[PDB]
Design an enzyme around this catalytic site. Structure first.
Site, mmCIF file in Angstrom:
data_model
loop_
_atom_site.group_PDB
_atom_site.id
_atom_site.type_symbol
_atom_site.label_atom_id
_atom_site.label_comp_id
_atom_site.label_asym_id
_atom_site.label_seq_id
_atom_site.Cartn_x
_atom_site.Cartn_y
_atom_site.Cartn_z
ATOM 1 N N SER B 206 37.108 34.783 2.207
ATOM 2 C CA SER B 206 36.871 35.657 3.334
ATOM 3 C C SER B 206 35.372 35.784 3.672
ATOM 4 O O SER B 206 34.749 34.789 3.991
ATOM 5 C CB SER B 206 37.524 37.013 3.015
ATOM 6 N N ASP B 577 51.274 5.861 13.851
ATOM 7 C CA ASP B 577 52.339 4.891 14.134
ATOM 8 C C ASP B 577 51.981 3.548 13.487
ATOM 9 O O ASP B 577 50.969 3.458 12.781
ATOM 10 C CB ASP B 577 52.683 4.801 15.619
ATOM 11 N N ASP B 588 51.584 -14.195 10.494
ATOM 12 C CA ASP B 588 52.345 -13.051 10.028
ATOM 13 C C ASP B 588 51.773 -11.699 10.450
ATOM 14 O O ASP B 588 50.561 -11.536 10.473
ATOM 15 C CB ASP B 588 52.335 -13.126 8.521
#
Ligand SMILES: O=[N+]([O-])c1ccc(O)cc1
Ligand SMILES: O=[N+]([O-])c1ccc(O)cc1
Ligand SMILES: [Ca+2]
Ligand SMILES: [Ca+2]
Ligand SMILES: [Ca+2]
Ligand SMILES: [Ca+2]
Ligand SMILES: [Ca+2]
Ligand SMILES: [Ca+2]
Ligand SMILES: [Ca+2]
Ligand SMILES: [Ca+2]
Ligand SMILES: [Ca+2]
Ligand SMILES: [Ca+2]
Ligand SMILES: [Ca+2]
Ligand SMILES: [Ca+2]
Ligand SMILES: [Ca+2]
Ligand SMILES: [Ca+2]
Ligand SMILES: [Ca+2]
Ligand SMILES: [Ca+2]
Ligand SMILES: [Ca+2]
Ligand SMILES: [Ca+2]
Ligand SMILES: [Ca+2]
Ligand SMILES: [Ca+2]
Ligand SMILES: [Ca+2]
Ligand SMILES: [Ca+2]
Lengths: 608, 616
Positions: B206, B577, B588
């Site tokens: 705090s 993604d 590849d």
């Protein structure tokens, strides 16, 4: 009087006020009892946590928020007993033919969605024969029955927020939405008992005070206009009605009171919102531990600052404002008189001077009334004009100057001048009044103060006696005086100057060439200057007096007299009748024989 | 991990964080002990008055705010013991040759007028031969010693308001004013013992958090730049320094946390202030009785509404976030991961589902982590991708759909599917994983869940519904005589395997080792497991599942109607993604997750579809 309502007298307004307060306290069912009691024992500093404990759990002599604790008193039953002692009995749903909700206590609950946490009490006053003479409508503030307190309070807080941030007329419409049907049933009940609008008293505190003001606003147009002429006394309301119907009572240091302007949220709502308001008592101070504390007030005054709500407690309203009602000074007060109510905890009372700090408020004007507790108080008057009331307990007074009335009350009371006895003049009329005149001419009239403390370079205590102020055998003499009787007297001053004390009856006071101090007392007195630089003193119900030979270097002093509005000067009270200036104060008057009104100056005329 | 700090890495940032919390908690001397305990027993509703009583007076097993109650335990001695167990011993004013003020506990007090209610603990860690290895600096948040709580708190709140409404850079200068001389003596004591800036950890909660950020702002120019490279972890700070030195940890529903931007009061300061901040953990929820309550949340979320302060309590910080530290999902998370921490009272826990309500916060993105308690929990995952961890206790899970991992933990745990068993497929690798596939193809990987509850059409031809508890067994899900079969499987071994699917489609479980999984014309589900696996489609609409440290794998015959599912894999930032993980290597497409990879032999990256590559 501060609580004068409509055109009702002083007395009838007080009776109305005391009832509004009784029914207002009833509506909370002593929920704050534990808080009030905790605070009284522990204070608001260090002991703040112990105070909060008691707010929750009470103790052996109080009940906090939590029900069913065996060692707590039954505060809710005490609340019922209290309202009955005041003359009030809850009217049942069945007496009214009401089909809405009540609880086991007879409390009525709000009727519509969004209003179901609203509470109101409907009460009857019954004469000896058992006939209905009066109805009391007491709306509850934020909070609900102890059983469902948190959930009910959340509902209330939404209602509170909507008053500030919701539809423009949300506060105005609150009673209409909450209790529209109930109040139709109250109208039928009243009619059935031969009562009209004037026999209905409406009160409440906080959100309940908001509801008072709502009802007044709706009263012209709703319930067939029946409640239009009802009596509306609201405590600590954030809102003021658009009408002239509501006496809005509160403490100026209560941040809830007048938070809104009359329903509008402004920048002042979250700070100091102490602007004068026509419907409101603007200058009543709860002198409690928070108000007195220098450290507390390093934080900003705000409804958002939770510890500031100490001044909001309904028990502090009931207890401190009842002492206003009971005050020997009550009939000197009007709606906006500055009144400082002693509301300190037991530990703070021991070492804190009750005084007008004028904290977090607009500047106070006119005379100040300071009202003690029935315990030992330290009361400090300002350098302007003060009315200090000790009540019970051994009280100690200080005062910074001006023109004052100091009432010791019961107990062994003490006036501390904080300066040498040589800088004051003392006079005693033999009828209980000790006059203290300071080095600047300011006069205190004191009663029931048997000890004077002075500093002699350093504290010395003098006993107030009939022969003078005494330190053992050592006497400070009273100024030369001629004392009358409660009969009609003729009193003549010596050429050296005298204090002339009429007492009761129509007296003839004959001044001489010296500086005399004339105190005609009660009755219609004729007072002749005789020359010199004279003082004429008028206090209480002083009668219709005539002053002969008043000139340029003479002083009138009005102190503890009727009809003095905060900061009145003599022009508010002066006219010419024939060749004479008349000064009127309520039913009392002074005629300055042959004196033109335009010859007078405020420095010659003290109005306190 | 969510509390990764500088370049200490996963494991060492966790240890650093546990030290920070330990010393942060110490600085409050168990002030909230009675509150935490009263809340646990009573809750925050009907039980609130009792919770508050315990907050003030404690009980026989807690101490509240009021000192010297004979029947309370000594919670201040417990705090001291706790901080010692963590390796720390407070450094005396004498060791420092410090001339300012301390109290009987050895707490240091602020040095200038307007800062005399500031408190700081200076602690040392010591090796086996007694030499100093580390210094901890723990600034106290609002509140002070029980002896003088109220007056001290008033001073603190005055400091709190000046951070918002006072001189520009009031918060920045707070540690300079309060502890400037103290910190000179600490530099000298550090140097005299062979330590530099990097052996110092600075924390607090705090206003103690604001102090961490202050000290970081000031560390470049003051104290000779000694603390420039110190370690800074702040809890529930209203402020954020202008440096890159501070990890700002808090709960997003804690109204104090990020109240200011980064020392500026805005319109959001008194409402929801949940804008992403670079230095801050932005998406950690304390799932407490207040957060859970419809009634409470009728009131506006604001630092000005005191009941919202329940999410601020240091004990709930300690307890909640230590369960995050301990999580089997920890190393999946990143600074801004949506994490929901089970923080309910005993009464609310019995009937309240722990879930992402997304209350009083910006929309959560990406996978959700829900961390249970060591008691019996009700945990509800959402319709997106979820990681649900029951911990100890008999836990019950529900989940709205998507791709999930559900760790029952110890205890007797239950997955309640809330609809018919016929709408799901079930597979089981015999290695402790029960796979649950919904009617939309959503897969949950479950561990330690021995019971499945379904909802079946029952009496009057399905007007009424039956709740059916199935036991998870080797041969399927069992209720009495009724067996729900697992989907057809070939299981490998923990060594290198060749596994061939039958033409109808199989779940192929490689397990550890470098496996060869040969698909058929059917719809296969490939789970290479740990190790480097070669997996050929064979035709059909195939699924390849990747979880954990899945290795370097090769996928042959991947087409348009196949699908990869990455679940519980490394390096998945909120809402990644495939594009953030994919590149071409020669002919590849390669997908990379931490040190693990999948090569889609022959497939062009341009031919790929977020439809066919599930990243969770
Ligand atoms: O009536 N009230 O406003 C109250 C009563 C009790 C309490 O503890 C707090 C507020
Ligand atoms: O640290 N805190 O905020 C606290 C802790 C305990 C308590 O009772 C009130 C406040
Ligand atoms: Ca209510
Ligand atoms: Ca007024
Ligand atoms: Ca005022
Ligand atoms: Ca008294
Ligand atoms: Ca005075
Ligand atoms: Ca007295
Ligand atoms: Ca007489
Ligand atoms: Ca007379
Ligand atoms: Ca004369
Ligand atoms: Ca004269
Ligand atoms: Ca007279
Ligand atoms: Ca402090
Ligand atoms: Ca962030
Ligand atoms: Ca967030
Ligand atoms: Ca899910
Ligand atoms: Ca659990
Ligand atoms: Ca479990
Ligand atoms: Ca294998
Ligand atoms: Ca296949
Ligand atoms: Ca393998
Ligand atoms: Ca693999
Ligand atoms: Ca295919």
């Amino acid at each position: 009087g501060v609580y004068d309502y409509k055109n009702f007298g002083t007395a009838d307004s007080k009776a109305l006020f005391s009832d509004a307060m009784a029914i207002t306290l009833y509506s909370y069912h002593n929920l704050d009892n534990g808080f009030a009691a905790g605070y009284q024992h522990n204070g608001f500093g260090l002991g703040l946590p112990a105070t909060l404990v008691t707010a929750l759990l009470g103790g052996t002599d109080s009940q906090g928020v939590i029900p069913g604790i065996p060692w707590n008193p039954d505060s809710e039953k005490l609340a019922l007993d209290a309202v009955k002692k005041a003359g009030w009995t809850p009217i049942t749903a069945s007496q009214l033919g009401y089909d809405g909700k009540t609880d086991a206590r007879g409390t009525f609950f709000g009727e519509k969605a969004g209003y179901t946490t609203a509470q109101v009490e409907i009460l009857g006053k019954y004469d000896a024969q058992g006939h209905l003479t009066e109805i009391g409508i007491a709306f509850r503030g934020t909070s609900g029955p102890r059983e469902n307190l948190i959930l009910d309070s959340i509902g209330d807080v939404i209602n509170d927020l909507l008053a500030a941030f919701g539809p423009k007329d949300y506060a105005k419409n609150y009673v209409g939405e909450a209790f529209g049907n109930l109040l139709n049933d109250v109208v039928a009940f009243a009619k059935a008992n031969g009562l009209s609008g004037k026999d209905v008293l409406v009160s409440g505190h906080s959100l309940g005070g908001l509801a008072v003001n709502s009802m007044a606003d709706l009263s012209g147009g709703k319930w067939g206009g029946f409640f239009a002429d009802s009596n509306y006394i609201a405590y600590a309301s954030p809102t003021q009605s658009s009408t002239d119907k509501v006496l809005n009572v509160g403490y100026e240091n209560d941040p809830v009171f007048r938070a809104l302007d009359g329903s509008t949220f402004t920048g002042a709502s979250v700070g100091v919102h102490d602007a004068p308001k026509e419907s409101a008592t603007d200058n009543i101070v709860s002198f409690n531990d928070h108000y007195a504390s220098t450290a507390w007030n390093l934080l900003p005054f705000s409804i958002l600052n939770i510890p500031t709500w100490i001044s909001h407690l309904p028990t502090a309203y009931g207890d401190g404002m009842n002492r206003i009602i009971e005050s020997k000074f009550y009939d000197l007060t009007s709606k906006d008189s500055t009144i400082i109510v002693a509301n300190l905890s037991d530990p703070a009372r021991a070492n804190t001077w009750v005084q007008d700090l004028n904290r977090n408020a607009e500047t106070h004007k006119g005379s100040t009334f300071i009202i003690g507790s029935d315990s030992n108080d330290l009361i400090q008057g300002g350098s302007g004009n003060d009315y200090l009331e000790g009540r019970a307990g051994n009280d100690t007074f200080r005062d910074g100057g001006g023109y004052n009335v100091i009432l010791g009350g019961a107990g062994n009371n003490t006036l501390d001048l904080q300066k040498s006895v040589n800088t004051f003049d003392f006079a005693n009329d033999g009828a209980g009044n000790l006059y203290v005149r300071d080095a600047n001419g300011g006069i205190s009239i004191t009663r029931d103060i048997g000890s004077i403390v002075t500093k002699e370079p350093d504290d010395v205590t003098h006993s107030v006696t009939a022969s003078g102020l005494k330190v053992g055998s050592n006497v400070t003499q009273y100024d030369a005086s001629v004392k009358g009787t409660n009969g009609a007297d003729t009193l003549k001053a010596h050429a050296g100057g005298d204090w002339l004390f009429g007492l009761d009856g129509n007296d003839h006071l004959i001044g001489g060439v010296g500086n005399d101090v004339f105190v005609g007392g009660a009755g219609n007195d004729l007072m002749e200057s005789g020359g010199g630089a004279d003082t004429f003193l008028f206090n209480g119900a002083f009668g219709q007096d005539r002053v002969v030979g008043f000139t340029s270097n003479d002083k009138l002093v009005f102190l503890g007299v009727q009809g003095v509005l905060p900061n009145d000067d003599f022009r508010a009270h002066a006219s010419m009748v024939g060749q004479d200036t008349v000064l009127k104060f309520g039913g009392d008057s002074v005629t300055l024989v042959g004196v033109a009104l335009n010859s007078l100056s405020a420095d010659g005329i003290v109005i306190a």
